[PDB]
């Protein structure tokens, strides 16, 4: 458009109606229980979240068309969240397939990995830039869409849920997360009884107990104000840990 502004980020993913066609007809093909879901409606719901609207208001409400038509239920007590240790999370339910993260659910499914805005009063996707979350603004459909889903998959889990933490970074639990600042606080202590973490082992640091960390103190503090336990584990070899879930017998 003659008034569209530039925004830091990268435009909206290449093909990306296409993308999100293929891959809603793909989940369900994979998932019978889901073949109920008309791919046609998805798209024009999601489509209809952020076409002609200024992406930097974008809001909740915008996007709740799409999650009544991506309506969902996963077994309550099979959640796994995560926290940069995005490989090892889904390699884990591609095994112990009875578990699930929000990128095996439908609507995670679809959007993971990809980027997209619009204009206000266009019809038109922009491919050319979209806004950044610290240079730009916030509230831009992509930040928008995963607080929102985020904290729906959150607040159904029940019983244990488990998070995987990566152990080689530097604040192996992060504040500035989806899973420090929208997760914890949505799982709900009426459901929930305990939260376990896993901390993935790796990088050059010599072999510890990681679950004395100040980042892991601090969030055992968080959880139990919120009146939730707190659990946690090493997991000192990712390698194997692997090899005994996909084979124990
Ligand atoms: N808001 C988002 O941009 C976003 C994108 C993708 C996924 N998600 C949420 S975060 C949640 C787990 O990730 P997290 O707890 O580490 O949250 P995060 O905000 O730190 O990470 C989310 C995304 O940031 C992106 N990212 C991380 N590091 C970089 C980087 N160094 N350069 C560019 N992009 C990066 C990457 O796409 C990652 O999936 C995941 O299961 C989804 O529910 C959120």
Not at 173 to 191: A, C, I, M, W, Y
Request: a neutral charge; charged letters at 25%.
């Amino acid at each position: 458009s003659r008034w569209r502004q530039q925004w830091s980020g990268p435009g909206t993913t290449k093909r990306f109606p296409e993308t999100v066609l293929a891959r809603c007809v793909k989940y369900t093909e994979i998932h019978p229980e889901m073949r109920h879901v008309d791919c046609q409606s998805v798209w024009d719901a999601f489509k209809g979240a952020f076409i002609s609207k200024h992406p930097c208001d974008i809001t909740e409400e915008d996007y709740q068309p799409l999650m009544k038509l991506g309506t969902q239920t996963v077994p309550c007590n099979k959640i796994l969240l995560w926290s940069r240790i995005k490989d090892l999370a889904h390699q884990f339910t591609q095994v112990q397939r009875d578990m699930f993260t929000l990128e095996d659910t439908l609507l995670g499914y679809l959007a993971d990995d990809l980027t997209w805005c619009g204009e206000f009063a266009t019809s038109k996707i922009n491919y050319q830039s979209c806004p950044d979350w610290r240079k730009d603004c916030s509230n831009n459909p992509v930040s928008v869409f995963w607080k929102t889903v985020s904290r729906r998959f959150a607040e159904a889990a029940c019983d244990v849920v488990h998070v995987m933490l990566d152990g080689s970074r530097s604040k192996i639990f992060d504040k500035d997360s989806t899973f420090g600042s929208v997760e914890v606080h949505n799982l709900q202590p009426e459901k929930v009884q305990t939260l376990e973490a896993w901390v993935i082992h790796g990088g050059r640091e010599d072999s510890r107990d990681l679950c004395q960390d100040p980042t892991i103190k601090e969030l055992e503090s968080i959880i139990s104000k919120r009146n939730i336990q707190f659990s946690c584990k090493n997991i000192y070899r990712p390698d194997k840990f692997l090899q005994c879930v996909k084979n124990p017998e």
